[PDB]
XYZ file of C-alpha atoms in Angstrom:
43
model
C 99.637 115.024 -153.607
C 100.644 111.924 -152.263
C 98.354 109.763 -153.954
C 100.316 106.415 -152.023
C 96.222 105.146 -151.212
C 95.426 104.628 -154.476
C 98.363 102.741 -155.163
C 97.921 100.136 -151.792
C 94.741 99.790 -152.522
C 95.810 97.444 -155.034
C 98.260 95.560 -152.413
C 95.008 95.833 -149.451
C 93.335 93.329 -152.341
C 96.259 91.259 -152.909
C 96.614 90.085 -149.017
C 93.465 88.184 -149.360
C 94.418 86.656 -152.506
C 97.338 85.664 -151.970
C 96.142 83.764 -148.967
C 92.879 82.284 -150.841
C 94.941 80.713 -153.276
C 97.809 79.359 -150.728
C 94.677 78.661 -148.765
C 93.281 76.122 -151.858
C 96.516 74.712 -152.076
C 97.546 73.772 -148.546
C 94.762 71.620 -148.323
C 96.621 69.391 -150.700
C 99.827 69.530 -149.663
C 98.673 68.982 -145.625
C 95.724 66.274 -146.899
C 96.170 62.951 -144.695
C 96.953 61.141 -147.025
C 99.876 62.676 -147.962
C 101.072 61.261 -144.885
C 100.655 57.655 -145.950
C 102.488 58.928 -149.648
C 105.586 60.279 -147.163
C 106.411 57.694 -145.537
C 106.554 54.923 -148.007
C 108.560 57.980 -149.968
C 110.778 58.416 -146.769
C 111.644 54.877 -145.597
C-alpha cells in the first residue's frame, strides 16, 4: 500500500508550526522600535 498519508500527516502539522514560531518571532524583528535601533545602526 501506499501508506504516503501517514507519512504527510506529520508535514500537514508542521505547516502550522513552522509559521507559529516565525509568527512569535517576526513580531520582534518588525517591532517599531527596531526602526529607531536601524537607523542610528545605519547612519
Amino acid at each position: 500500500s501506499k501508506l504516503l498519508l501517514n507519512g504527510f500527516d506529520d508535514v500537514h502539522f508542521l505547516g502550522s508550526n513552522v509559521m507559529e514560531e516565525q509568527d512569535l518571532r517576526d513580531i520582534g524583528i518588525s517591532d517599531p522600535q527596531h526602526r529607531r535601533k536601524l537607523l542610528q545602526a545605519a547612519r
